[PDB]
Enzyme design. Structure first.
Site: not given
Lengths: 332, 327, 327, 332
Positions: A13-16, A21, A130
């Site tokens: 689904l995506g790469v960090g 993921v 935050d």
């Protein structure tokens, strides 16, 4: 297959920086999830002050409807797996860029959801973080979801807008204060479809933020405008607190019961008239001054300490003198 | 003319390494208090790994009725004042050695108080600290009060029991040993002696236990469960709470109410479904949910099933006011 | 008649949310200081998750020459006084915008100072805090001083750069971004402008970089290594320390000496042996040992081999004065 | 085989509440180790205040010759593995029960080793843990080894003897103080073969401990007896510190260099005569009083703060005015 624990991994689904993921599904119940795979080797080569090691051991398994759930964490020799709630919604503020403003009722519903998660975070998080609106998502059912549960938003990759006055400056802050301000511009974005302070370049932008004055569209009733003014106070000491918002008439309308916990507060039936009077006499104050401390749990105030000394040392025992244990103790 | 905040300090009630403990009284209300004076100089010269400093900043203001109350802490350039509840009674184990054992009615009452404070400590103490029965005092009103809320038994300047796991020096969580520790206290109230220790140190280890003439079989079952040598078999706080002998004449204010029990738990569908897909029993799954064991793959599966329900608000989301556990 | 400890407080130098900052001078020695007054009441009413309280108790007394010194902290019942070094110069990035860029000689000096403080922060700050160039001041003596040692830029009441990983909101350790942050500072000293930001917010993201006429190829290689978009490819503090441009006229006191380098490292036998049994290179194994990467199976193997040697004291045990890393 | 990571598991060396300890060997280098297997399920059912979770995340990989090494920690979904240094020695105090007292030279050698580890622990441990002699082992080469590196002694299963005065009482203590006292009875046990305070039953036992007076065999030279008296001070404020022992002539004899780190101390050549004199004048004190603070790093003392203010604000710069950065900063 690619399988870890009870979960079968799927499409990326995506790469960090520290890993990808992948979509996953529980091998038994079949439910779909999003699994973040953090690579121990990548982390070790980067995290030298131990920040990330730290952020990870501060995680808790969050069960809240409007915060992305961390169902559990699975460990292997070379990897760490985080099994999370699968949410395909995209950013909330992205939906607003596309759809424009929402109606009061959908604004209130969503706002109540978001604020529910923020409060939950304040209660249960080792370290404060935050609230960022980019981290606010909305699932397939139009439900608010906070993306950052204490590690970065894993869900989404790839701003020119908000910062709280204390934040734009170099000033020290607690952060529930700025969360309120942050939650203020979100609520405003929902009703208006614009930010309360969006001025063109940086000099004029953060300038009006310090002014606090903002445009008020006509379809905004004075009840929500009063709330919006309080949340957006430039003076943090004057700014609305979660309890202020919680007690606001506009907010309280059609408020789902499960959202907020039933915190026991102080009730009039607990009041000890003799003790109240003794304090007001021995001090200069009025009952309002002392009652205000009891209702607001301001127990470190010299008035509250005195009142409590009298209650605890009464010889005869009362039913209502015992609110002490149900509560958590405060810190210095 | 020794006055700090609203408090006028009095005779020195006790002297410690890092400062003395003076009795005081509130300047407006006449109430008596016990003030611990901690000296920044003494501390600075001694705790070089920061243990004491850490312990002090881990303190919270404990207002539980059966734990010594910390009313407030006042700071001065050279000192730190701790304004606490003044309790002038002696150690409970001291009272039992002089005057004999107590009756079922008074033992139960005292035991319920003590366990109430212990539970409170388990919940809000930052770092766990084994309950030491020497730290249990008994006031003029005959109410139990635990002295150590996270610094020291501050009040006062003798065979010793320790849980099996403690004596052998093995790894332990500590609520386990607290149950065991509270077991010998409960025994002491009913008997007036310790359940094992008749001896000096070597034989105390391997040392069930003697059962005096009138002990109803109800209290013997409880003591037996608490005094289990195997911690994996030992009673838990919730077990004692649900024990018949304990439930008798139990004061309302003692324990908070959040057990999730029937209608708020009941998921007939997930109950069995987990029990089917995993091959196990209802008892096992139930056990994880009641505890903070949500990280158990049974609980994780159950929750996955619960959170993906269609319309059920009553069981699904209504339980989420408590706290999350950690991995 | 406003005096705290040995310090007499003066004109209010700045006012914060939780208290003001007054200038002071030592009562015996005439030295000037900057005193931050934190109000227990304001704090108590605001930090309800304990952030500020935590941050305050995480403070240490920083005596590094290029970081604002915390000389001491004094406590009163209603307030907390922080006695700090008084530095009246303005922000460094402010000085560069008014008066032009500096020369190689002065840029290097300032850069070495700044990196010295950054390294010190990485070592002894309890919680990491991104280095913000706005927090870099420059005193009357033209020496760089980092304002935020763990509370706030306490001193003072403008396009913004952030590292690629920070702008995209992804997970990061922070020494990485500190290197990147220090990169744009180094660039600012030599150029007098920022390496990317010409703009307002959207285009700043994706934004190598311009290289002014006389920049020797030595400093361009360094800036290039520090400004790497990929953090896994980005320069580390030790890389900069070993860079030729940096090593020039480097003051002795700036960095501590514990790199383990040749004779104290050299194990000819384990060097290759690990490189044989694992199929990898010398460079890789060397890399783990220099860093705190001892948890790498290469380092673990190497150490297993080292600790089981017969007689070698020089390499084996002489290195064990530094610190252990964590799992 | 039973294999985890690079390690092949072997015979069970002992069983704990939370798991067993199996012998292992690195599959590549062939070195033998002791692997503690902690079961996540057992831990979860027991550790409800999070004590154990906590103790484990506080572990560091200890490289010290006289403390059992934690080479690394390996994680699996159901288990946690701790790969440690393999030490087959049995308890040190057990060796003393068997062999009796040792000679001065073997006592000194071992004592220097033990104290080396204790100091290392004080420096690097997140939380302090009292030194227990039962946790002191001696390997096949007659080398001292501290068994508890921050999780319980895994090595050994299955006392009537020592406790420090502050410990026998209900008193608050820092713990390096009591470590010294503990290290005192160990040193005594080495030379004598008995404990300094061993009285028969509990009333008389802990009684003499508070007295501090102990028997002194004739073969004990007055130099080691002076050390033994200082370490065994009942008053912790009067008790020897690691630096005291480190500077003691008896201890310093034949002391291996690698044992203790070369801590930079304060040197006479650093001294600023003008500043020293200014302080002594403006205050009442003498140079000894001020010098004592500088040599002992007593930097929070008003004399040291003054001296430093003068040094840091000198206009001309000195070579020796910079001892600041090489040091770590202290805490409040």
């Amino acid at each position: 297959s690619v399988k870890i624990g009870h979960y079968i991994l799927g499409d990326t689904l995506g790469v960090g920086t520290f890993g990808k993921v992948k979509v996953g599904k529980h091998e038994l119940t079949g439910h779909a999830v999003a699994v973040k795979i953090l690579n121990r080797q990548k982390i070790r080569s980067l995290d030298v002050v131990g920040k990330i090691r730290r952020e990870i051991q501060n995680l808790k398994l969050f069960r809240h409807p409007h915060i992305i759930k961390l169902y559990q964490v699975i460990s292997t020799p070379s990897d760490i797996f985080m099994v999370m709630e699968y949410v395909s919604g995209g950013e909330l503020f992205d939906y607003i860029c596309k759809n424009g403003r929402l109606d009061e009722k959908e604004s209130r519903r969503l706002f109540q959801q978001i604020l529910s998660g923020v409060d939950y975070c304040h209660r249960h998080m080792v370290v404060h973080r935050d609230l960022k609106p980019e981290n606010v998502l909305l699932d397939a059912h139009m439900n608010a979801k906070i993306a950052d549960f204490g590690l970065s938003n894993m869900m989404s990759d790839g701003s020119p807008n908000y910062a709280a006055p204390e934040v734009i400056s170099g000033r020290l802050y607690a952060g529930p204060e700025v969360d309120i301000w942050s939650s203020g511009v979100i609520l405003y974005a929902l009703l208006c479809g614009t930010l309360p302070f969006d001025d063109d370049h940086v000099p004029t932008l953060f300038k009006k933020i310090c002014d606090g004055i903002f445009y008020t569209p006509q379809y905004l009733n004075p009840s929500v405008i009063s709330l919006l003014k309080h949340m957006l106070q430039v003076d943090p000491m004057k700014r609305a607190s979660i309890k202020d918002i919680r007690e606001h008439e506009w907010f309280k309308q059609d408020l789902p019961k499960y959202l907020f916990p039933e915190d026991p507060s102080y009730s009039t039936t607990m009041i000890d008239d003799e003790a109240l009077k003794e304090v007001c006499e021995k001090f200069e104050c009025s009952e309002e001054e002392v009652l205000s401390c009891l209702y607001n749990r301001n127990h470190q105030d010299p008035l509250a300490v005195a009142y409590h000394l009298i209650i605890d040392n009464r010889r005869i025992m009362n039913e209502a003198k015992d609110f002490y244990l149900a509560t958590s103790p405060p810190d210095s």
